[PDB]
Chains A and B, each alone.
Chain A
Amino acid sequence: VEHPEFLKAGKEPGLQIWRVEKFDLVPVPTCLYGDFFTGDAYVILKTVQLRNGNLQYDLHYWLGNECSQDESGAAAIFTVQLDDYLNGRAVQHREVQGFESATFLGYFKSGLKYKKGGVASGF
């Protein structure tokens, strides 16, 4: 995909977070990393550099308890598309609010926060 955010994904070790907003992938301001709108869906790419220097990719789509079906659907599809764009090298992980994996919770050094609301459905 020619998605402009794809061109930025997975270049260096670190965390990148996009929110689904009306059928598009929109980057989250870095200062908001870790506060999730429970009414929204997100795509999180974690890039780890191994001891070799080689890049490893884990791709999490995070689903708020109140996100609309278009948001959770787009998050899943965007995840597949980014994985495909990354030559299939990402391991994909479905993250549900309240039930995230320890690996995912571990990405947030001061612990992730939930907050109500979010961006309106694209439907």
Chain B
Amino acid sequence: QALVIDNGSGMCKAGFAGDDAPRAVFPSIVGRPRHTGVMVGKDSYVGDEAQSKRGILTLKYPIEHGIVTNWDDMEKIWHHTFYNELRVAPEEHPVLLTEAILNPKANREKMTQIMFETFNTPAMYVAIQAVLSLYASGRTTGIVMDSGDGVSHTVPIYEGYALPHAILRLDLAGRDLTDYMMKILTERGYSFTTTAAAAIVRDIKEKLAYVALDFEAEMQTAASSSALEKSYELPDGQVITIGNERFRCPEALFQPSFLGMESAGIHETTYNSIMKCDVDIRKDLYGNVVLSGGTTMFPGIADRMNKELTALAPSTMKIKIIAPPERKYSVWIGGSILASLSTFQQMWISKEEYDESGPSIVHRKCF
């Protein structure tokens, strides 16, 4: 029984290889006391419980833009995952973990070390998240557009392996979108003032936002009619109306200038990655643009990516955008499938190999 853990900036996804969906999805947050020693309960809380008790904790995210920045806190996340979420003893299970593209060498080693030395895993494997999403989509070649909470990436992959030179990174993702939505609703005339403000605005974004096919035309419709407006009930029971904010918020993926960024949008980043690849494979990248992650979850996003890439590529290029409804957990599902393969027991780093080679074994086994 292998375990699959997909660690993200915002959310940890965890479960059992062979399941078709994560068993546990929780915020990637470690809470520690503001004042030590004076009250019952150094000391820590993880996930939803940390969020609940946030008024008396200092909350931290161990993962920033997909990369681990606090190993002490990451360890708390894994301990909670094993013991509280999956309810397993980690020494009893092979563990598949996931990593960002271009994950620094020292980080891959530290993760391996923590698994074998702290958690006594009998076996582990680290897989690249985008490659996992591609496999989940039943493809070995394509370009993955991964957008989560802290980071977006375009990742071309050919015959099973990412092309590192062609990879592009956009530091604009879901957190930026939630903030932008807060900003533009505030300007409309609303005021999100309670402690639940970030979650209310995030929920409005997740429930009511969409990507406009033609942005200027939607702005028009929205200005001239009330056809696009939706009501949203606040926790207190107040009902507010969400107008053009529904599509203006995710528009910032296509127009990072909305956010004060000079960078290219997601359609252009995708195109730029494709153009860094050998001309002979481009047609297969355009024909296999896989969307993956929570921030790809907006309705209309695929149609807009198709439209934008169509305008960027020669007119005879076949463009296919692949955006399955379950794409929020594509990485996890690809891991589940990989970890279930009759061939997976020969892929993993065993405790025995770790003992003989130490943490640098990961570079030789996992790529």
Contact = CB atoms under 8 A, between A and B. Distances in A.
A1 B343 contact: yes
A77 B338 contact: yes
A39 B83 CA distance: 38
B135 A76 contact: yes
Interface string A71-102: 01111111111011000100010100000000
Contacts, number: 76
Interface residues of A, number: 28
Contact of B342 (A23, A70, A75, A83): A23
Contacts of B342: 3, 23-25
Interface in A31-83: 41, 61, 63, 69-70, 72-81, 83
Interface in B302-356: 333-334, 337-338, 340-343, 346-347
A76 B330 CA distance: 15
A82 to B, nearest CB: 10
Interface residues of B, number: 23
A59 to B, nearest CB: 9
Interface string B117-157: 00000000000000000111011110000000000000000
Given A1-B346, A94-B138, A69 B341 contact: no
Nearest to A82: B343
B184 to A, nearest CB: 37
Nearest to A91: B159
Contact of A70 (B20, B139, B159): B20
A63 B138 CA distance: 8
B19, B159, B333: most-surrounded residue (chain A CB, <10 A): B159
A10 B146 CA distance: 36
A81 to B, nearest CB: 6
Contact of A23 (B20, B340, B346): B340
Contacts of A70: 20, 337, 340
Contacts of A74: 337, 340-341
Given A122-B340, A123-B20, A83 B159 contact: yes
B55 interface: no
Contacts of B334: 73
Nearest to B158: A92
Contacts of A63: 138
Contacts of A1: 343, 346-347
A123 B140 contact: no
Contacts of A75: 138
A61 B141 CA distance: 12
Contacts of B134: 76
Nearest to B342: A24
B136 A69 contact: yes
Contact of B18 (A2, A41, A123): A123
Contacts of A24: 341-342
B322 to A, nearest CB: 12
Given A3-B343, A77-B135, A123 B141 contact: no
B138 A81 contact: no
B141 A94 contact: yes
A11 to B, nearest CB: 20
Nearest to A81: B343
A25 B333 CA distance: 19
A2, A41, A72, A77: most-surrounded residue (chain B CB, <10 A): A77
Given A25-B342, A92-B140, 12 more contacts: A2-B346, A3-B343, A23-B18, A41-B138, A69-B333, A73-B138, A76-B135, A76-B138, A77-B160, A80-B159, A92-B159, A92-B160
Interface of A: 1-3, 23-25, 41, 61, 63, 69-70, 72-81, 83-84, 88, 92, 94, 122-123
21 contacts: A1-B347, A23-B18, A23-B342, A24-B341, A24-B342, A61-B138, A69-B138, A69-B333, A70-B20, A73-B136, A73-B333, A73-B337, A74-B341, A76-B140, A77-B135, A77-B140, A77-B160, A77-B337, A80-B140, A81-B343, A122-B340
Interface of B: 18-20, 134-136, 138-141, 159-161, 333-334, 337-338, 340-343, 346-347
